Design a protein around this ligand. Sequence first.
Ligand code: O1H
Ligand code: O1H
Ligand code: CA
Ligand code: CA
Ligand code: ZN
Ligand code: ZN
Ligand code: ZN
Ligand code: ZN
Lengths: 514, 516
Amino acid sequence: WELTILHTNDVHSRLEQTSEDSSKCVDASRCMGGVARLFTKVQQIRRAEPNVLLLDAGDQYQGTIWFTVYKGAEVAHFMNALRYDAMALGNHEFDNGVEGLIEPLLKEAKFPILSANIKAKGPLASQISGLYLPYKVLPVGDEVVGIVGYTSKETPFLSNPGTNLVFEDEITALQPEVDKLKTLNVNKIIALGHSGFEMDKLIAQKVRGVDVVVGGHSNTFLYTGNPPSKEVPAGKYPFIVTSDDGRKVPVVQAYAFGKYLGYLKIEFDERGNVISSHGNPILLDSSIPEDPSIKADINKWRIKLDDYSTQELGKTIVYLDGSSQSCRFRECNMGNLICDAMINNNLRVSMCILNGGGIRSPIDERNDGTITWENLAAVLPFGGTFDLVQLKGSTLKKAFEHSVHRYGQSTGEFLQVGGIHVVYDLSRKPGDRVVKLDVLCTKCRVPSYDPLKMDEVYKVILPNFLANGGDGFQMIKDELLRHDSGDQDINVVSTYISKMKVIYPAVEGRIKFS
Amino acid sequence: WELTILHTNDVHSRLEQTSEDSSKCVDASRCMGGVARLFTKVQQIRRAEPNVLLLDAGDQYQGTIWFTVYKGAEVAHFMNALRYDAMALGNHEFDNGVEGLIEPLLKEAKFPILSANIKAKGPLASQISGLYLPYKVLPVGDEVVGIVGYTSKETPFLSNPGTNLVFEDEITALQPEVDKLKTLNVNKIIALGHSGFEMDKLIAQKVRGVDVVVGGHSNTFLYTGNPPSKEVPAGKYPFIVTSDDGRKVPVVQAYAFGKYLGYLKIEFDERGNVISSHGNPILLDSSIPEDPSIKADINKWRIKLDDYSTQELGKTIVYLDGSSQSCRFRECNMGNLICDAMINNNLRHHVSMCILNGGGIRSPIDERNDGTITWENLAAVLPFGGTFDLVQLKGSTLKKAFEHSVHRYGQSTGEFLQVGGIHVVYDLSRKPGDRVVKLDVLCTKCRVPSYDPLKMDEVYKVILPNFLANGGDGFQMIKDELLRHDSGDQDINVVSTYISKMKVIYPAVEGRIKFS
Ligand SMILES: N#Cc1ccc(Cn2nccc2-c2cc(Cl)c3nnn(-c4ccc5cn[nH]c5c4)c3c2)cc1
Ligand SMILES: N#Cc1ccc(Cn2nccc2-c2cc(Cl)c3nnn(-c4ccc5cn[nH]c5c4)c3c2)cc1
Ligand SMILES: [Ca+2]
Ligand SMILES: [Ca+2]
Ligand SMILES: [Zn+2]
Ligand SMILES: [Zn+2]
Ligand SMILES: [Zn+2]
Ligand SMILES: [Zn+2]
């Protein structure tokens, strides 16, 4: 018995086709992704193959003005038009609180929404009953396939789920669900969820009964053979994990932003054991036509976003690299621009820290350098503030160690900086990787970089998200000596670009590796 | 027979009293120098000692809006009121060309103006004839004292003396003059000139018959004992040179900007040989009152200078270090500010690299006056009225410019480069012309700018002053090897427009220049 799995993850409000770097589509002839194109490819597979499932591994919420304006209503409408079979909750599904998940998405979706490790309590428990499920048993031809869902246990530190939801350990909560399916004679089981590639391999190894793992969160690109675009593979597609019960478990992910459609063909025996598997993500480029009916519908919804002011805030003569491949791994000029904008607005304090997890999109310079509100909203969508904090040298050293404590997994805590020169040695054990930390003096007439002192006190400008312990920055929230509310994030950056008129941020050696 | 030599050098238009860093006077209670205070000190010494000479070793011209507006007429007027006995020509006396030296200074000074190594040719020979002299024999009581002048051989690369003036080697030109003085029965000889401390010491050692050397140009601070202010001594006052003809020759200098009055008391024998010498520069601080007559006259002349729009151009929240002790020796934030203003103004109407000679940065700016920056504060930093131009350069040409930048490091010369979009590391222990150990530059043929090592065979677009594109400060490799040269915007206007745009400025020392 053969099953075809079609899968998307971390679409992040890319409803329309985009530029290859997943920023706004300008040169339409070379544009990729979007739901209109995705529908054409999905229909080509469904008409050719008998047993097909279309799955989403979370983070459809947040990314463009489509979500700023429609707040998830666009997600339910277009995922329904594409006839997704199941979706697992991501951390971004909680960005507008529980109320912002229930009303636009859970009540309007015509497909099951899954998460086995999220438990509701108090008054909310009765209100959210049946709105999301731990699993779904789906008929596929004359057979049945069990799909078990999971969501990152880190969601309370990344989003707004509130106090009436408990995030259990993924492996602990998934085992009673898989066991229940096996007692119900469901021999084919897919683990679909949003925790990242490292947790996906752990679920494949330790959750007895799981046949295939379909994940997201880490924007992992897997490929077998010569890759078709700029994404570099982290391993082969699928990635094979040998479980603790000696079975080969395929693990898959399909990058992010709807650029690719994941495609895996599984050969099962009569007892639901995986005999073999093969496939690859499919690049959704201009050679695949956008579906005419979906496009016409996308255009109708686009009218409300078209009333947004298309006025030029300013110009860039350089590419503004806000890609996660850069800003979560190294110094990126978008990070330097925002940290310099933060310092400049406040002086109208020489040090700045900014998590890569907060930088959500790059900005292209080829459209006569024009920067609009729409371009900026995709970079800074959370509506947070840039606040003043007083920190000890020891707290600052702890935040920089946390910045790289699990380097290489594409996590949000990596820090972009202003008025700070940091050197990291990744060969050293976690918590002892900062080899050099020089900061700009304040008690000096002429500013210059001096070694950080553990017993000294520093004034830093950072997002209110980090002062509140976001991205696991617990040492900031617990040890800060002062915290003053600042100006709105996007407004600080638009004001800076308007004053400067022409911007040119560079990678100047603020972050170095040994 | 006893003689007291009072001496100034590199006053650089500091007519009014200044802040101790020699920028604008704001907190008057702590202000120093100025001609009014100098007059009180000179008057105190003249009434105490019968045999006194007041000498200037050049570079009175250029430094503040006093020179922008009065163009040397303030120099002649106030040097006459102080009754200077003689002055040697400096490089800055040629900033407004030969016509700018002849009309307001040579024609109005009531004292001799000297230089034994400058020779006139062409039609100027007849025009300038006798306006400046190789020497002057001065009566001092019952005796006579010979004073021979000299000017830096480097002046054509630093100023505008023109094609009709020839600069000879100092030692070659001075010896025939000193020998002539001996035949004229002049047994006491002072060499007064503007070539720097290293040349002053060579003059003392090799020019037979010279008794004392009074110099300038290098802003050298000499002192015996504990110094009274922030200047660090380069040696004792006086510095003693053992001459080739077997004598002890004192060499003196008195820093710059009229902050100090050089004071040297000499004991001569009957044949004009130095028996002994002692003194020190006198710090002209608040303990010496300003002469009321000179002060009133200074206030009268300042009326026309206030007409300069006192409108706040912008604000600084940091000290703007444009001092020579910094910008001629290491990375200074005033240099970073100017190079950033040069790149920003050019990108307004892709050029990522900037070079700027420390010799072009003429004053710091203080942040304590509510951070206010005016046209007067700026005109003291950039007074030459030059432009910031676009040039195309080979990687080899740029590497050579950075080698020339540190080829004779430690003499406080102007060729040291301040940078923008460049990361340079020097190792001074190495031979000259092989001191540049690291040179990284910002890419231009990239979507994201980043630092990459310089390539000898590569071609770069640099913003620099027109002065450097024309071989100023000895940058012959720039003038001779550049591939393109476009005219730019006025230097001072580029910096003021940037400050007005930014509103609040805070330049830092970031590690653009490093030493190994
Ligand atoms: N503890 C805590 C905590 C404090 C504040 C918030 C505020 N908040 N409510 C919903 C979304 C946001 C929000 C706001 C701002 Cl300004 C953010 N910058 N980055 N970032 C982000 C989002 C996703 C990932 C993935 N990995 N890292 C991430 C970081 C942001 C989330 C949330 C939680
Ligand atoms: N070769 C040649 C050459 C080319 C151009 C000029 C222009 N020029 N005419 C008079 C004064 C200036 C002038 C203009 C500008 Cl913008 C200058 N920046 N620095 N600097 C300077 C002056 C003094 C010292 C001492 N040491 N280094 C110096 C450098 C400047 C002089 C002069 C000569
Ligand atoms: Ca199975
Ligand atoms: Ca003698
Ligand atoms: Zn995501
Ligand atoms: Zn996620
Ligand atoms: Zn001088
Ligand atoms: Zn000079």
